[PDB]
Design a protein around this nucleic acid. Structure first.
Ligand SMILES: [Mg+2]
Ligand SMILES: [Mg+2]
Ligand SMILES: [Mg+2]
Ligand SMILES: [Mg+2]
Ligand SMILES: [Mg+2]
Ligand SMILES: [Mg+2]
Ligand SMILES: [Mg+2]
Ligand SMILES: [Mg+2]
Ligand SMILES: [Mg+2]
Ligand SMILES: [Mg+2]
Ligand SMILES: [Mg+2]
Ligand SMILES: [Mg+2]
Ligand SMILES: [Mg+2]
Ligand SMILES: [Mg+2]
Ligand SMILES: [Mg+2]
Ligand SMILES: [Mg+2]
Ligand SMILES: [Mg+2]
Ligand SMILES: [Mg+2]
Ligand SMILES: [Mg+2]
Lengths: 99, 86, 122, 137, 116
RNA sequence: AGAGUUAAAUUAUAACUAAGCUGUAAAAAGCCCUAGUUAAAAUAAAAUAACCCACGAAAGUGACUCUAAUAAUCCUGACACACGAUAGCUAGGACCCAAACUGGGAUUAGAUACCCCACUAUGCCUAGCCCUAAACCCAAAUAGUUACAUAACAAAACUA
């Protein structure tokens, strides 16, 4: 049987190290007009805007390439005990899953 | 007074539009606080009174700065809501 | 190098300048100084008009004199350069090469300050 | 078109003329804009006064001469008396912070005179004499 | 960058002497303030003065100067149209920012926690 | 603490030019030996940097330079010792500018105030006194803990 520690140590999310500037693969699970809700598999989805080039190629279910900035957007503000979560992740939409 | 003249707080007007040059000057002076300083030196302001002002200003700035920061951080989430009428 | 003498001399011809520098350095060696070096930063238009010795000056020659001197004597040299009518304006600074540069390791970022207020629920 | 906001230093070769004169040779229009009154004096590059006009000179009286209108009227007048003595272009120097600042400037233009550079020289002490006490104790 | 808060306020732990004395506590509020309406100043004053000069000169006969009258009128029309049409668009469009209502709602969706 | 120095203003004072200048919510009184520009010693005070948070026991200290210099192998401690903002006193010197007082001008029922103009003690330097402040960060010094735990408000609660 695999101890939890053993799993955590080998997982791809541990392999990544710091999540700044990492090329990642993500998949679009929801759309509002120009807004793509992209699950890249970490915790929170990110949300990017539908690009001008090949706009109609982006559909629920599509796969895309992301540049991860921050795994969760969070900060502490003046006078607060805890940080504030936006409940989102920060990413740059590059192109779609060149294959 | 012992410096050379006309090199300082001087703007040269372009294509003869003066209102614009003057605006530029006034922006230069506002930016460097020369305007507030001029205005504040019309009367004297006793030291304790000045201490109090500086402190109030810095508080004010801290707060505005931080509120602004939280605005620009929260700004993403103003987008049309995905989950409407859930 | 221990002190730095910043000399601003009246702007003149070659020989008279040379003379003023010579007599100046001599005075320095008589107040007990040891002169390391003599640098010439050229003659320029002074940044503002300088009034000295019933003259209103526009240009000036610039010189640095690095020298070691007994602590007592800075007042003496100062007195001397004061009353020389060829000097536009003298100054004596602790030589900038004595102070040595500590290492900025970097900028330590300062976190927002916490717990300035209690946990009261308004 | 390269246009520098900064004026032409004297030692420079820089070639710009207005009616054939160097930037240095152009007359100066001094404007003192103070809270109860605005005064204007146009002067030679060599500092011989050409023309003088103030809001008082213009026949306003105590409070009225504070206003912008008054200032403008003094501007026009100054510029007339000036163009009489034949000054086409002038470099403005604005001294003071008042109700009459801008107004007297564009009054100098309205009154048929051409403004090239507009400088602010306002006394800003770096802490000399202590100004008078505040109003309403 | 925000001005430093370390060491500034007077607190039992702080070694030094206060720098700020805040009048009201520094805690981000959950709403913003309401935009200050612009102080008005007189309009058309220049065209007025030019017309008044034209009158003083020509002895107040209206036939004499039709240009300055007509242009003062034109200007007063542009100031009326300005007063009417600028009110609404200055009251809606903030340019790069949001109307204070939307900001307040956004700030209630992700409020400050003083407590806990 | 000494000694030396001065950029920005400001002023004596001349030179031109203009009849006004100053002053307010608005005026008056004042000044026209005034005003603008160009020249300028002395005196006093130290834009910006500072959105910094350092030094000192505290009071206090933020123009520049140099000299001297910031007790204790660091517990607490007086009525003893040495200091101590502003104001004030004595004596001598300074005086740009500010200004209690006072005198003019308004305001008002009155106005021994607020507002306007002049001007003094005083603010400065040397020497000596005086020993007071909302001298308050209204939170004693020195070691500690974040356990138990909300009168209220405020700057969270506590141990020795
Ligand atoms: Mg009182
Ligand atoms: Mg301390
Ligand atoms: Mg309070
Ligand atoms: Mg000076
Ligand atoms: Mg004198
Ligand atoms: Mg009178
Ligand atoms: Mg300074
Ligand atoms: Mg020690
Ligand atoms: Mg002890
Ligand atoms: Mg005392
Ligand atoms: Mg005294
Ligand atoms: Mg005396
Ligand atoms: Mg006196
Ligand atoms: Mg006075
Ligand atoms: Mg009286
Ligand atoms: Mg002394
Ligand atoms: Mg105190
Ligand atoms: Mg007490
Ligand atoms: Mg004790």
């Amino acid at each position: 049987v695999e101890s939890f520690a053993s799993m955590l140590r080998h997982s791809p999310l541990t392999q990544m190290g710091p999540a700044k500037n990492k090329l990642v693969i993500g998949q679009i699970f929801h759309i509002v007009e120009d807004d793509l809700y992209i699950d890249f598999g970490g915790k929170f989805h990110c949300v990017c805007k539908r690009p001008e080039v090949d706009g109609e190629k982006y559909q629920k279910g599509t796969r895309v390439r992301l540049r991860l900035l921050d795994l969760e957007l969070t900060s502490r503000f003046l006078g607060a005990t805890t940080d504030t979560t936006i409940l989102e992740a920060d990413a740059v939409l590059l192109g779609l899953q060149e294959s | 007074a012992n410096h050379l003249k006309f090199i300082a707080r001087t703007v040269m007007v372009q294509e003869g539009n003066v209102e614009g040059a003057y605006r530029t000057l006034n922006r230069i002076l506002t930016m460097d606080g020369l305007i507030e300083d001029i205005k504040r030196r019309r009367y004297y302001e006793k030291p304790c009174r000045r201490r109090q002002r500086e402190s109030y200003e810095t508080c004010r700035r801290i707060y505005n700065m931080e509120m602004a920061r939280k605005i620009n951080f929260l700004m993403r989430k103003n987008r049309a809501d995905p989950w409407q009428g859930c | 190098p221990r002190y730095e003498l910043a000399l601003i001399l009246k702007a003149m011809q070659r020989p008279e300048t040379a003379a003023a520098l010579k007599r100046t350095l001599e005075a320095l060696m008589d107040r007990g100084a040891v002169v390391r070096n003599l640098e010439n930063l050229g003659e320029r238009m002074l940044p503002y008009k300088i009034s000295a010795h019933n003259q209103r000056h526009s240009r000036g020659g610039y010189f640095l004199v690095d020298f070691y001197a007994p602590a007592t004597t800075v007042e003496s040299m100062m007195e001397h350069l004061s009353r020389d009518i060829d000097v536009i304006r003298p100054n004596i600074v602790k030589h900038p090469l004595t102070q040595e540069v500590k290492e900025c390791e970097g900028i330590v970022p300062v976190p927002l300050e916490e717990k300035l207020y209690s946990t009261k629920k308004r | 078109s390269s246009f520098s906001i900064y004026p032409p230093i004297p030692g420079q070769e820089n070639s710009l003329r207005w009616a054939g004169k160097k930037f240095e040779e152009i007359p100066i229009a001094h404007i003192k804009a103070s809270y109860n009154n605005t005064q204007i004096q146009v002067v030679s590059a060599a500092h011989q006064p050409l023309a003088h006009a103030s809001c008082g000179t213009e026949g306003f009286r105590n409070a009225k001469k504070g206003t912008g209108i008054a200032a403008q009227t003094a501007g026009i007048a100054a510029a007339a008396k000036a163009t009489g003595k034949g000054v086409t272009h002038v470099r403005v120097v604005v001294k003071g912070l008042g109700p009459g600042r801008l107004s007297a400037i564009k009054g100098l233009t309205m009154g048929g005179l051409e403004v090239i550079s507009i400088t602010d020289n306002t006394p800003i002490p770096h802490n000399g004499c202590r100004p008078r006490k505040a109003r309403r104790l | 960058a925000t001005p430093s808060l370390r060491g500034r306020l007077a607190r039992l732990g702080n070694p030094r002497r206060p720098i700020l004395k805040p009048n009201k506590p520094l805690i981000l509020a959950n709403h913003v303030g309401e935009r200050r309406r612009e102080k008005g100043e007189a309009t058309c004053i220049t065209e007025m003065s030019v017309m008044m000069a034209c009158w003083k000169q020509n002895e107040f006969r209206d036939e004499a100067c039709r240009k300055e009258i007509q242009d003062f009128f034109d200007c007063a029309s542009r100031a009326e149209a300005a007063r009417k049409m600028r009110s609404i668009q200055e009251n809606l469009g903030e340019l790069g920012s949001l109307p204070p209502k939307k900001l307040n709602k956004l700030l209630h969706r992700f409020p400050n926690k003083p407590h806990v």
